[PDB]
Amino acid sequence: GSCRKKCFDASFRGLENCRCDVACKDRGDCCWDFEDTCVESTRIWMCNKFRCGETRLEASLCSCSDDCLQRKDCCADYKSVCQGETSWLEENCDQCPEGFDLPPVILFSMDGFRAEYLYTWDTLMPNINKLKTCGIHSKYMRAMYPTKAFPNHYTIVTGLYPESHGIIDNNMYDVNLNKNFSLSSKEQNNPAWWHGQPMWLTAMYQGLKAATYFWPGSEVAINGSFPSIYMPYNGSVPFEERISTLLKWLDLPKAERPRFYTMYFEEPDSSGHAGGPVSARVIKALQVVDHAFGMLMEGLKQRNLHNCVNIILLADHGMDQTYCNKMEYMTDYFPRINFFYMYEGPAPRIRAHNIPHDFFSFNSEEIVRNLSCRKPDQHFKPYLTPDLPKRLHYAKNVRIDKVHLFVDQQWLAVRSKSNTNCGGGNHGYNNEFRSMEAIFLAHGPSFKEKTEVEPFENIEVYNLMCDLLRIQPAPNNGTHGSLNHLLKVPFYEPSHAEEVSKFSVCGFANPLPTESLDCFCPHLQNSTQLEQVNQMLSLTQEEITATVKVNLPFGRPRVLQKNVDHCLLYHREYVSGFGKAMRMPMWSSYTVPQLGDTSPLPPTVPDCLRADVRVPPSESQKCSFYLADKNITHGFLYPPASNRTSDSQYDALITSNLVPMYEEFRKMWDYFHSVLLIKHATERNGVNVVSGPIFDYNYDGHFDAPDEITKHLANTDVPIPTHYFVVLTSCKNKSHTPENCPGWLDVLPFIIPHRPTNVESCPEGKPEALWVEERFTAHIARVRDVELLTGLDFYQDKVQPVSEILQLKTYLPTF
Ligand SMILES: *[C@@H]1O[C@H](CO)[C@@H](O[C@@H]2O[C@H](CO)[C@@H](O[C@@H]3O[C@H](CO)[C@@H](O)[C@H](O)[C@@H]3O)[C@H](O)[C@H]2NC(C)=O)[C@H](O)[C@H]1NC(C)=O
Ligand SMILES: *[C@@H]1O[C@H](CO[C@@H]2O[C@@H](C)[C@@H](O)[C@@H](O)[C@@H]2O)[C@@H](O[C@@H]2O[C@H](CO)[C@@H](O)[C@H](O)[C@H]2NC(C)=O)[C@H](O)[C@H]1NC(C)=O
Ligand SMILES: *[C@@H]1O[C@H](CO[C@@H]2O[C@@H](C)[C@@H](O)[C@@H](O)[C@@H]2O)[C@@H](O[C@@H]2O[C@H](CO)[C@@H](O)[C@H](O)[C@H]2NC(C)=O)[C@H](O)[C@H]1NC(C)=O
Ligand SMILES: Nc1ncnc2c1ncn2[C@@H]1O[C@H](COP(=O)(O)CP(=O)(O)OP(=O)(O)O)[C@@H](O)[C@H]1O
Ligand SMILES: *[C@@H]1O[C@H](CO)[C@@H](O[C@@H]2O[C@H](CO)[C@@H](O)[C@H](O)[C@H]2NC(C)=O)[C@H](O)[C@H]1NC(C)=O
Ligand SMILES: *[C@@H]1O[C@H](CO)[C@@H](O[C@@H]2O[C@H](CO)[C@@H](O)[C@H](O)[C@H]2NC(C)=O)[C@H](O)[C@H]1NC(C)=O
Ligand SMILES: *[C@@H]1O[C@H](CO[C@@H]2O[C@@H](C)[C@@H](O)[C@@H](O)[C@@H]2O)[C@@H](O)[C@H](O)[C@H]1NC(C)=O
Ligand SMILES: *[C@@H]1O[C@H](CO[C@@H]2O[C@@H](C)[C@@H](O)[C@@H](O)[C@@H]2O)[C@@H](O)[C@H](O)[C@H]1NC(C)=O
Ligand SMILES: [Ca+2]
Ligand SMILES: [Cl-]
Ligand SMILES: [Cl-]
Ligand SMILES: [Cl-]
Ligand code: NA
Ligand SMILES: [Zn+2]
Ligand SMILES: [Zn+2]
């Protein structure tokens, strides 16, 4: 015989007197199968032909003995390797066993698994590829900025932007605590850094036990509590050991068995850093993680759990390649740099060197000014954080330093040329960069099968996981219901938000104005001319219904602000919502048709403004306000030169269509409406436009209350916007116009900062054709971002399921 079932038996002589004792290795008389049967069998996580039926040993990590199933310690592939059962991988695409009344949730993260890995190398990852084929598969998942591990892992489990959850980078300083946060320090375990409610506490608070294996934050007594089970972090733990512990937890008695699980792997992030995203090291790491993931599914199948668990496989961010010849140096821009401290790399920040003493005295403004437009080809742009694109939601936290550098693809910004941290993979860049996109795959009885879904953001996963466990989520930044199309039977059915402030009436009464408002239009020097022109503002009921049909084709925006007095101004070519206290419109809606001639609109007739007879002078702007205010002029919300009849431009040359605009912004503003808007209308077969002011002086992402607004027009109460929004909405099916679209819509939203100079664009002396469109593109945002910043709610009259409208409102155009 051989060593099968005779390991370490010195008294045993088999064929040709071969021996199976520990000393046979030296004497050189071992039976042929000794090493694999008796030595390597205690160092591996897999059964094989040598091990099946084996006699139990001591130091074995798992068992292939005939009693392992009753003892509950079989290796994961025992049944398929030893019992001839079909592996999970060999099974076709798709049930809970006894005691698993409800399906547990596994949240599985593979650090640095970028969406392109799954596109190019899927055939090198058969287990992951099987998950993608059989379950639900998003084109990619968008991370939050900056695309770092701790900020995004904690976003995933809280539903919160970093500015809200507190972990705004892997390295940061908090002047209030006067402490430093870093991944190698014990300060990261101070619960004071961790705000919000992570998913394992949401479950625990609502009666469901939670086990975490190495998830960021799970080793912290957040809000005073650890997870039910958690593991002190140690990256050296083999992945198979982690998977085996997860399967053991699923073997706990029902009364002790967690319902929510998290799992974390350092790969392919670690190999991405070492070798770059296209490298043998990443390829090998991708095969390793795929092997360990398969181990999990095989072990689930051994327990008949493969189709009972709702598993989500995703990642925190992607990976890009860096170069030592693509580095920007602060020494190139400052003669002395020893007075400030720099968080370096793909998403740098600059703060005072002497902290906490000079933290707030630091002249962040001068730093950003001296870094602006210094070279024509400089590969980063400095920002004060309130000036960053609003879709990043990266400003409202004292831990976010005011000075920020937004760095171009594959570049790095460092202090000095001494820096050698280059040549490998890195991340942290703009979350819209393709290289920073992450994967999201799910599978389970609650998910749809064999379904590909559009991209979505990692802030949406928290609500989804609460829906999977049928519990209520803590308040977060997801849009609940936006991921219902992932689910067979949604747990949460969304509904339209009900309007808070009802609209008033601004009907047409007297054709002459009680007050001139200090506005002048010599073209109407007589009174007969005025009465006729203003009469054009009088629309019949039939004319009101016609303009609403074309220019409000999805229904008016609803006001979710409280105690806001507003009325609707009907015109033939546009409808607006006038904010009485504000003395300017909250929104203006109009639909731009497709035209053959792409002739840019001509300039508005100048020197002609008059009052709105429908709006009383107490609630109207005065043209003298703008003359008085030397630092700001007036702009038009609805473009008057886009008139489609002989004298309809008069309908736009009224005080009710005026908004405060710095001269330099209005140049940008008018170019967009005169040139770019027309192109968008011709490409989209017409486009509906809704535009208006945004006030966010505390840069918290929410509309300001009137008493939060700190800048006003001249000596009046008329506020100056911080931003203007422009939402372009057309029919996804280009065969239809925006007003005759029975299917899905297609949106392109802008949130353009209203700044007194164009230094963000470094015009330098170039025509607007060479930088305006670039500036607007940099400030694309979601509709929901506009809703949050305005207190408005869109598309409520679009006949379509709410959850599909929620998909539309979370969509981010990318380029
Ligand atoms: C941090 O942990 C504490 C627990 O120590 C959480 O406080 C608990 O919050 C829940 C939900 O708000 C409270 O339950 C509610 O109480 C009201 C008042 O009777 C009741 O009407 C509701 O139906 C619900 O039962 C609970 O009382 C409260 N516990 C304590 C001791 O204050 C807190 O929410 C956690 N915070 C975060 C951010 O995780
Ligand atoms: C920030 O820059 C100012 C201005 O410096 C000039 O503009 C820069 C954008 C860059 O092009 C420099 O090469 C220019 O010299 C600095 O203010 C100047 O400082 C020098 C001292 O070296 C002084 O002699 C000048 O009078 C200053 N000019 C003004 C208008 O004040 C300032 O020092 C820079 N700030 C920091 C922190 O370095
Ligand atoms: C859109 O309106 C422009 C402007 O109309 C002029 O300005 C208004 C404020 C009002 O004073 C009107 O009575 C004016 O006609 C139209 O451009 C004018 O077009 C006429 C006839 O084609 C021409 O004689 C004028 O010189 C033009 N004036 C300017 C400043 O361009 C334009 O025709 C209107 N578009 C359509 C489709 O009717
Ligand atoms: N609970 C945990 N505790 C400590 N470290 C963890 C952790 N979970 C993951 N990590 C570590 O997070 C690291 C990945 O995060 P990264 O964003 O790549 C760090 P970085 O910002 O690129 O540079 P840095 O190392 O200077 O912080 C992994 O190497 C891993 O060791
Ligand atoms: C947090 O880390 C910073 C460096 O990242 C420390 O900064 C030092 O601050 C002291 C005075 O506070 C200065 O004398 C040193 O020159 C600073 N060092 C550097 C490298 O800038 C800071 O001390 C740390 N704070 C805490 C509480 O640990
Ligand atoms: C993201 O969601 C969080 C949680 O709902 C919001 O944070 C709250 O904001 C209000 C008003 O700013 C504060 O009074 C609360 O204290 C905040 N809570 C927390 C936990 O920070 C946040 O406003 C949302 N962000 C956006 C951009 O909408
Ligand atoms: C980190 O992990 C290393 C690898 O072994 C693992 O940890 C030991 C303690 C056992 O739990 C073993 O089953 C694991 O695979 C250890 O060698 C090392 O000591 C650990 N370091 C720390 C600080 O815990
Ligand atoms: C778009 O919609 C088409 C049906 O629309 C009707 O037919 C076309 C030709 C136009 O005349 C339109 O005004 C009509 O209402 C579908 O047949 C077609 O598949 C759709 N296209 C896409 C890309 O979805
Ligand atoms: Ca605000
Ligand atoms: Cl089954
Ligand atoms: Cl003026
Ligand atoms: Cl500016
Ligand atoms: Na002025
Ligand atoms: Zn990472
Ligand atoms: Zn990393």
From Swiss-Prot:
Residues 1-815 are extracellular. Ca(2+) binds at residues 696, 698, 700, 702, 704. Its main location: membrane. It is a single-pass type II membrane protein. Induction: Up-regulated by stimulation by allergen or by cross-linking with IgE. The IgE-mediated activation is enhanced by tetradecanoyl phorbol acetate (TPA), a stimulator of the PKC pathway, and inhibited by the P13 kinase inhibitors, LY294002 and wortmannin. Up-regulated in invasive bile duct cancers. Its EC number is 3.1.4.1, 3.6.1.-, 3.6.1.9. Zn(2+) 2 binds at residues 269, 273, 427. Binds 2 zinc ions per subunit. SMART domains: Endonuclease_NS (SM00892), NUC (SM00477), SO (SM00201). GO terms for molecular function: ATP diphosphatase activity; bis(5'-adenosyl)-pentaphosphatase activity; bis(5'-adenosyl)-triphosphatase activity; bis(5'-nucleosyl)-tetraphosphatase (asymmetrical) activity; calcium ion binding; GTP diphosphatase activity; nucleic acid binding; nucleoside triphosphate diphosphatase activity. A motif (Cell attachment site) lies at residues 27-29. InterPro entries: Alkaline_phosphatase_core_sf, DNA/RNA_non-sp_Endonuclease_sf, Endo_G_ENPP1-like_dom, ENPP1-3/EXOG-like_nuc-like, His-Me_finger_sf, Phosphodiest/P_Trfase, Somatomedin_B-like_dom_sf, Somatomedin_B_dom. One of its GO terms (biological process) is negative regulation of inflammatory response. The active site is at 149 (nucleophile). Glycans are attached at residues 180, 223, 234, 370, 477, 526, 538, 631, 643, 733. Its cofactor is Zn(2+). Residues 104-489 are annotated as: Phosphodiesterase. Keywords: Calcium, Cell membrane, Disulfide bond, Glycoprotein, Hydrolase, Membrane, Metal-binding, Repeat, Secreted, Signal-anchor, Transmembrane, Transmembrane helix, Zinc. Monomer and homodimer. Belongs to the nucleotide pyrophosphatase/phosphodiesterase family. This is Ectonucleotide pyrophosphatase/phosphodiesterase family member 3. The gene is ENPP3.
